[PDB]
Amino acid sequence: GVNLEAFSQAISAIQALRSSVSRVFDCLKDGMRNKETLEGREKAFIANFQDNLHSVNRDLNELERLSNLVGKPSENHPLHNSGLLSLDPYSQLLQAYKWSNKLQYHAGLASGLLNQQSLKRSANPQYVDDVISRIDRMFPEMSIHLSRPNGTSAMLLVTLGKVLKVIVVMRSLFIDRTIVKGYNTEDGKLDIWSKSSYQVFQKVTDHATTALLHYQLPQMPDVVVRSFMTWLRSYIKLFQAPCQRCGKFLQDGLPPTWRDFRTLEA
Template sequence: MADGVLSPGVNLEAFSQAIAAIQALRSSVTRVFDCLKDGMRNKETLEGREKGFVAAFQESLHSVSRDLGELERLSNLVGKPSENHPLHNSGLLSLDPVQDKTPLYSQLLQAYKWSNKVTLGKVLKVIVVMRSLFIDRTIVKGYNENVYTEDGKLDIWSKSNYQVFQKVTDHATTALLHYQLPQMPDVVVRSFMTWLRSYIKLFQAPCQRCGKFLQDGLPPTWRDFRTLEAFHDTCRQ
């Protein structure tokens, strides 16, 4: 572990900075939800409460954007670990002279690679269009999809290329209609963001009615407005 290298291909110094960046990002996200939780308080007039809430909310979002950008920058510096997978004594299985009849080692290696990915990384992007304190519309896309137009502007109209995220977008539109409280816009934003955050387990949560992860090739894309439980479209009736 010399010269700041954790293992072949991994930069130890960048790795340490990335951990600190993750902690900073988590703190920024927590401040966003704290802002939504507190709502429009500590001001005498409605106008003062609205201005104070908008300013605090925007500042919190800018902090999240800044910390996320820093984390992405550091992630590119960390590097990749060696492709060699230490399977210890199981590696001796590769010496089996009859691999064509008992390919146990290759199967074990593939299983290790698969299990090393049981966790999900970045899955989706959400564009939330706001007019003053009110959420106007929401577009959900896959994380690998482009969210900008050819001239570099944010694309707030194009649908996702994936059916699963089109479904989530439709459900988000329904959720906006459900969480309508014109006199309490901060409560609407807080409630909607809490509901939206339930999609963090979009591909991990089974349907609460049928117990299946997939139905017609899709995960449970509906989230109950009250309990946030996952359901397939046909199972939520």
């Protein structure tokens, strides 16, 4: 359902075609103003004609989009407009929808902008952890499960597609002390402090510790864990390395900027 963008682009293209025709026929109403060496108006004429051709081509290309207009006559919208004439004395519902959309977008933008708040300083619950863990596990290809073997510590474990599972410990909040290990583990009947790797997942554990020390927000730990999980999800490909080659070293990954590249290059 991305037809709204195509429709907006088509509207803009038609408006551009109209404006280009208007500009062409307004400039053609004026000869060479002042050349004194050679009539350079032919260049502007050719540019305007090429712009008209560009707009026509853009309209023809947008014609390829907009596959079909589905049925479902406004998707349960007609209840009093197309329904009983008593019911529609109706615009209140549409006004409420538009106002809610505008309020949501405006509040989102305002929050994203005021994220850099001028807060000087801060001066003058083992039930929601399972819920937050389940809400985070609701994401695809991120099957996790917490064990809590010793005390209130949430010694959970994650695994995305590979056998590179990560035993990320927690403290009922602001989870820290993570250790990544690939291709087998859980010795005995619990987690471990092995951290064994092939000199590659050691860098991954270092980056994960840096991230855990990086996302330390003053409040809202649920958003912190969600950001941590969507940051960790970027390790599902490992098939990119800008600013260098793919194999500059043995390993290649550091995406704090949502673009993983070769290490020792940041």
